[model samples]
Target chain A: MRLADLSKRSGVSTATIKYYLREGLLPPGYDEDHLRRLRLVRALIQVGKVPVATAREVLGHVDDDSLGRTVRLGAALWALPQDAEPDEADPAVAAARVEVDRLLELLGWETSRELAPLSPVHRSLVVAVAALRRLDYPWDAELMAPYGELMMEVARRDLDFMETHASEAEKVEMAVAAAVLFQPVLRALHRLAQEEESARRYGIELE
Target chain B: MRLADLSKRSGVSTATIKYYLREGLLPPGYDEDHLRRLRLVRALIQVGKVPVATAREVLGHVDDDSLGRTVRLGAALWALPQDAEPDEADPAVAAARVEVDRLLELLGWETSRELAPLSPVHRSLVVAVAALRRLDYPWDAELMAPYGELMMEVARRDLDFMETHASEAEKVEMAVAAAVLFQPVLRALHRLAQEEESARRYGIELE
Candidate 1:
């Protein structure tokens, strides 16, 4: 299809398609696959509300079946955000590290030495636990074990869907999709769930 | 306490605290509650990673206990996000609204008529579902029921904490705290849980 026809059918502006080509989000020629990816790219950028760099990372590898696992692995890794990194020597950080270590042992989960510091998610784990201590919640690893177990159930259901798909590209797409899309869902659902729980426990009706 | 003393005790930089003050996160003052609020502000902005505008919204009302439930009512409400308010004339948004309304009814949810557009979280729910449809997941409210149930369980535990704190400021503080801080905790736990689940189901150990 010509670029204009592609523009008309895909509903992506020709300028955007051209930019995608320049960004290598699309190639110069049109194919059914390109058409599909353009739509995907549009959704991701416009709807997925993904960061541009992260969206590019996903789009760059969208067509590569071989990199499905690769695209996802780094996406899997996280580190403590540096600006927020509590000093390792600080008592708060020390306490958090001990808790993190204790949780890993309790869960029998292993992480690299710097995994907490090097990954956004892991470090977030540490800081959140520490924040709990500051709040006097004393949320030890044991306290979080239940949350972990529950999330394990949730993740199983989520990953089960990805595993059902045979295509590496599709798996990567859904894997990435699950990652980007689920955060808001989780937060929104958590809020809604709070309303239900509060209503049930306190005997207040939800309107 | 002097600003320096507040800085020393709380570990928030004087300049950053001043930035918060200049940004209207805190008014110019050297006092005890201000001390505590500065600390809360620090956490909400730096650790909980609440945005400046949102932090302002929450903290601006923190001292105003009259707005306690007021701050949290809609703060409590969330729905799916909608794109360009689909004209009733537009079939796409119209179709999405039907799906949204159908799902809410299937789930027995009560929301205002125009919820998906006004609420960030709810609209996100709509988009996430649509994204699933795009990915061939065929997920609808029926499919989302269990997820909602699980999240309700999660929210119960979260709100249980608020039940313990009696002070209005403290309650509101935590209400907002739980909202922003727990996101990372949830995402991290979800990832960690995925690691455990994938390992268990697929025999792929995460070290």
Candidate 2:
């Protein structure tokens, strides 16, 4: 396929695609692999908030023949954006981190506690937990355990869906896109469900 | 509650607290009601993205004796931010809206189709669905039904949790804060679960 077709299919600008090619961020050839890589690169940069340079590095690993498939995909996933270090100076933040660790332990999640500073998902959990604590809202391991169990079910379903894809690359793309786009869907659905509950509990009717 | 104590408890700045009082966004009392209202106002503005003047209007309704508790809380919750209208001129966005409606129908959710343009959660679903379509991701009613079912369970649990609060006003506060703060916890937990699934499936280990 030509550059214009690639641009149209990928929904990336021709100029941007050309620049990517020039910068070695993307290889030439608008084949199926190229299209998949372009989509992954776009998702990494636009949706995942990964820097273009880092995206290039990630793609390099993704395409590296020397690395095993798991490592290649793992490197790409890990290279996605992460939260900055929390100010543990605040007693609430310190306590929030402790609560995060406790919740993880209760769930038997395997991520390292020491990597909380560097891990994106773990750091985000800490930051959000801290915010709830600061607001004097209830947040504890017991409160969060149900959420963990439910999400574990949800994630298993997500992987089951990803497995339907034919290629490892396509699976990775689905994983990344689900991580970013499906979130808003979940958030919206959750809010809408809240409205349903509110209306039911409060004797309000929606027409 | 004194102003200082209110400021500390609500975690809202004294100046901002004073500003809200002057703007009629908050009532003068620093009692528990005042603390609850202050928290709601802060969540509306900071988390819900409601404008200050609009928040004041919502709170007026909340405090109005003429309105029932249901209508009062409804006014506050409804006044929270909605998404801007999608450009249905785009074929993808238009189709995405249809898909959103189909998903709602499949779930038997009670929100009105006419209100899609105005409803925050409805509009958000449309926008997210549109982005997924634009990205060529698979999305349809069949794909989203399980999510709807799960979120309904989640929202019911959320309401049960809110019911534990003693007063309607306090319940409203819990509802608002839970809507905002618990989302990040859910999102974070979902991502961590994804990581665990990826590791399990791909022969990767988390240390």
Candidate 3:
């Protein structure tokens, strides 16, 4: 498809799509996955509100068939962190790793940091925990346990869907869609549910 | 408590804390719930990366003791939409509203547009569904049932915590924290769990 066809179909501007092409975010020639890739760019850049580099890393993970499953799985985790990268041996990050391990153990999750596919996840845990700590909120293993369990349930369903996709590229796109869509979706549901509970608590009758 | 105390406690700067005070995001003077309010400000601005105006609406919801429960609950939903305000009579938004209502009906959720406290959520649902359609992903009620059920389960637990707080303000603060903090935490866990599943699928033993 021509650039105009892509822009009209994707609802992304021609100029931005051209930029993506120039930056190698999309392929240089006529492509079968042009529509799919354009959707991804829109999701990550426009909808997901994540950086282009993050989007690139995700595509990179999907592109590599030679990598181990763990490596492929860790791509988005690596991309999502907006923090300045310190040395992996930095004391704070090191301690954060320890804390993440403890939480993993508490949750009975069976992943290890040493060879974990989710090292980026561990980094995120450290960052999230630190943010909580800075605000004097105890983001302890105990507090995170239920949430961790909830996510397990959610992720299992997510993986079930990923298994049915036609290709690794398609699987990655679905994962990206779920990740971006569910945040706002879940957030809204929780808020609505909270309102329901609030209405009930204050004796505001639904009927 | 002094303004200095609020700054020290929330890890927000003195100037920003003072600015929050000036903007009425905090109480005017020394108060009993100063710490709680400061935490909310930090969560909104620093953690959730929300604008000051959005934070103020949340504070407004918590601060107003006179509004009904529905109004208070709707306050955050109303303010969280970052999209441009259209004619409330815009055809697309109106169509989106109808679709949202249909989903509510399909899910057996008892909320009405006239009485519901989640207008932004409806708009968000419309936007998410459209994006998924553009990507050719199915987001029908059948697909959303488990996710909807999941959110319901999560929300009930949230209210259980909300029920335990000493005052309405404290409850709102907890709700806000749950809203803001859990997004990253849940996203990471899902990614981690997906990695674990990928490892298992590839017969990469957890041990």
Candidate 4:
């Protein structure tokens, strides 16, 4: 197809499509794959409102040979967005940070012990666990060990699924999309399972 | 202290305190425990904005001789808030509802098979799981077995903790409060564990 055809199908102007081509946001091609890439790039920029430069940089990883495919697929594992960590001056937050470290050890996952400063997910855990401690909630490393095992099982399947299937782009999309999308599904399922367990043990039926 | 003193400390008017007394929202007492109960009743009505009659009904469970302590404690497990279920007219929602029932069976939970219509958590699962299916995400019951196992483990500990420790009121508070409070802590921990697993398998350190 021609550039105009690509623009028409993607709902991106030809001028902007040409601009994307020159900017390396889209490769120099005029095929169905090229149109699909253009549509995705436009959606990332316009729909998701991601910064074009960031999108370009992230997309570049698809073709980069320096990292393995599994690594590229797991890029969003760190690069995904997260809220800021809480004030360390607060005693609960400080204690929760220690608990995070203790939890890591309990899970037996090797780390550089820099997750509090580096991993968004780790920082998030610190903040949330801090809030839990403040509320006098029972959220210690021992209570979380089984949860850690569960998440490890999930992570193993996530990696295995990505490795065994899909194009690099598809794999990357799965990595990013699943991180956000499948979470609520799992959480909701857990809640539902809790309801069943609650009923079975307590002999109480829900209203 | 007299009724006036209780009213002054609780910040509920003497008239309202008398009303609550007559309404049985507060049991017949005027000790320090009675003052504490009055304060809680005021908080429930003002801070939580709960309906006065419903508050009385829930409070009745505290001393209800009909149910066991565990059953009373888990009343909130079913009564907790949940959004409305999705329209069954939508094929995605209908399919997801089936997936939820299948998930219950996979976990071997002896549900009444009425969760879709009765349980708040089950309704939430249908809505969320439907969204996942519509998005072409991998969210079948098979993918959710380990998560069910994890929640069951958490539920076991939850029941154990409540049964083994605390007064009846404290056990009820733990049941209701932990249901709402500890969810984010577990979710954040899971995300953090995902990060660790992602790095260990991919040989990629997070930035």
Candidate 5:
């Protein structure tokens, strides 16, 4: 696939893709042919479901000259195999943890310590990846990109709610409430807080 | 002043104050008899914020018993004097509109919708309180008494933050960012999708 074809499939212009490439948001084409590998990369990106911006960031961070590095990293991070072990002693576990830690550090993320307790869902994903790596599974990064992207979407919403709410007392209350109301109610409490905050901030005194 | 002396100065019972109080969350109270007037209704709450269990929910809603219907309703609908005029109205305009509508419907809150547009700082406080209301605001008849009793402290924090931070977005941002980042990041983004949907339902997202 040429730049023109890649652009057509992505609903982005060839020039924009070139800009992304220049911005180090996207990897440069493979080989001088450029067209063939660029098409494969675009298709891979679509199949992976990676956000264009995020894909670029992840690819840039991996520093792989080829699209394969970006896709591989995405796969390893997102698609853990089914049979993986829970223990962090696994080589793949160490590798993934190290890479993620490096990225966090690069981002100047002091808050990673606060998020140390991995949830069951995250743990499962990690284990799946470890299994895949252990078994030498043959999967493209595109296979796991969507799931990885989804994790961020989830985090952004959670942060947005909490940011809007901004009270220790309420956080404690919602945490307590979750024991009974479960996740939906917990989320409702957050959304309600955010909406209320929005209302109050705007001086929209009800009634 | 000692707890008893301070309580006397404030005209609130030591036992009730001690039982209802949370540490380091309130301003210091004095023991002097002459300080009674100095220790205005506002000052008493300023000394030591109330416990979340008692005051958290009542912060936003009206309570007919403890505060009388008029005052409770007023608190729900009226903007504090300090939050009267904000630097900018964009973030809070929609929120203010929705809140006014809800307050009118639920609490019969009728007062001037004259709260100044929220500055970024005040908006942050409103957002916090709104969050608190969602988590702890009582809906059940049985919860009303407790809710009203606690409203005093909630009011204190709401007012105190406004006084201290003024229009400082930096301070507000600190609190907001902490609230947004730590809790949910630790929670691994559970219930985030549902929350985003709720935000969309309220038409609060800036798009």
Candidate 6:
């Protein structure tokens, strides 16, 4: 499709599409002449559920030779699991698992199998999956496949923290602390990360 | 101190301070000779943790008679509690109490006394106050003062919802759903409120 058609259909502007193309954020069209890639890019953006800017960033780096290796891992990490049940799983468990897995893959890290016994994280994941499912979210099993391993890593980390700094009583205290503080702290951290990332990308100094 | 002193302390520029003053976000200086309010404004920005732009918007309508009355109540609502028990309180319980109170006050529009007896909410509040107290957070009592009333209101709402939506057997399901879903939902709503409020105040439109 032409840029105008793509823009109208996607509710984005033609100018913005051109900017994306110029930035090499959009792939080349299948045809040699017209911007057929515009439609593909629009579809990718819509399905990926990302802003135009982030979509552009992802596409721009999609083929970087040095980053390609990491991207492959990311793709593996991003794929959903088959035969997943979200309703019974805890969302926090799923979130923790997904994040840990993505981070591990991105960082090229490994873990032990002994940490598989922790069921709280799984419970959280099941809950998360269930709620998202109820909300009619388009999550597939493939999208959640890596999270099983990821959450195990998170459980491992929780155990590691307990071992490192806390006594038995303090461990319980810390667990309580984690329950209260983790969500708010993580929320704050996510907000900070986004602001920092935007500022860095835009060349704006933090105030 | 001087504008430069305030600027150096707060890491905000003199120009921005002037902009704040001009926008009436900061009150006039102690003396007519210099911008003495600079320190107070900067402290409010830094210590009070009021965003720079929000400070300006707050100041703009603060003196508009009808609009201004809401400001005091709003400020009271946003004010950090003096009684935060960061270490002693179970974070989940504390968070639940604070969230319940905030939602009740903002959404239910009920008075504090009318809504105080919900044991779970009160227990959470007590734990939070103890935790904050242990953390040596300043103004702990002041921070916690409104929470009791807020919890009371939330308890009323919870009872109302239970009465309206569930039977005895279904009450357990409803409770689980509320714990699992509403917690995250409320957090999301809180995030949206802050983002929208910030954007509206800064004249930024959501994309």
Per-model chain A TM = 0.71, 0.76, 0.67, 0.64, 0.29, 0.30
TM-score for each predicted model, relative to the true structure = 0.66, 0.85, 0.73, 0.68, 0.24, 0.24
Candidate structures ordered by DockQ, highest first: 2, 3, 4, 1, 5, 6
N/CA/C clash count, model 6: 48
Docking class of 3: acceptable
Residue A60 alpha-carbon offset, candidate 5, angstroms: 5.4
* Weakest 10 consecutive residues of candidate 2 chain B by summed lDDT: B110-119
Q: Which residue runs of candidate 2 sit more than 4 Å off their true CA positions?
A: A1-15, A45-54, A57-75, A112-117, A166-174, A203-207, B1-16, B45-54, B57-61, B64-75, B112-117, B165-174, B203-207
Against the true structure, whose TM-score is highest? 2
**What interface Cα RMSD is found for model 5?**
18.3
Instruction: Give lDDT tens digits, candidate 5, residues B31-125.
Output: 34223222222222331232343232333232234544433433433322222332335444444335534433343222222332422222433
- Residue-pair clashes per candidate: 13, 0, 0, 0, 21, 48
**Can you write out model 1's per-residue Cα lDDT over A126-150, one digit (the tens) per residue?**
7767765664446677867777767
For model 5, the superposed segments whose C-alpha errors exceed 4 Å read A1-16, A27-57, A60-189, A193-207, B1-25, B30-187, B191-207
Runs off by more than 4 Å, candidate 1: A1-22, A26-44, A47-90, A108-120, A127-137, A163-174, A195-207, B1-40, B48-124, B127-137, B165-173, B195-207
Q: Compared with the true structure, what per-residue lDDT tens digits does model 4 show for residues A1-207?
A: 987888777767889988988888788878767865665565455434467776676667644568777656445444444677689899888888787788778778766265446667777888877765554446677776776777677666655655553245354554543355446666776666556665565555443
- Residue by residue across A3-103, what tens digits does model 2's lDDT show? 78888989999898888887777886668778777787776665566788877776676566776765566666666666666797999888988888898
* lDDT comparing candidate 6 with the true structure: 0.36
Ranking by lDDT: 2, 4, 3, 1, 6, 5
- In order, what lDDT does every prediction score? 0.58, 0.70, 0.60, 0.64, 0.35, 0.36
RMSD of 6: 23.4
Model 3's TM-score against the true structure: 0.73
- Candidate 2 similarity to native, TM-score: 0.85
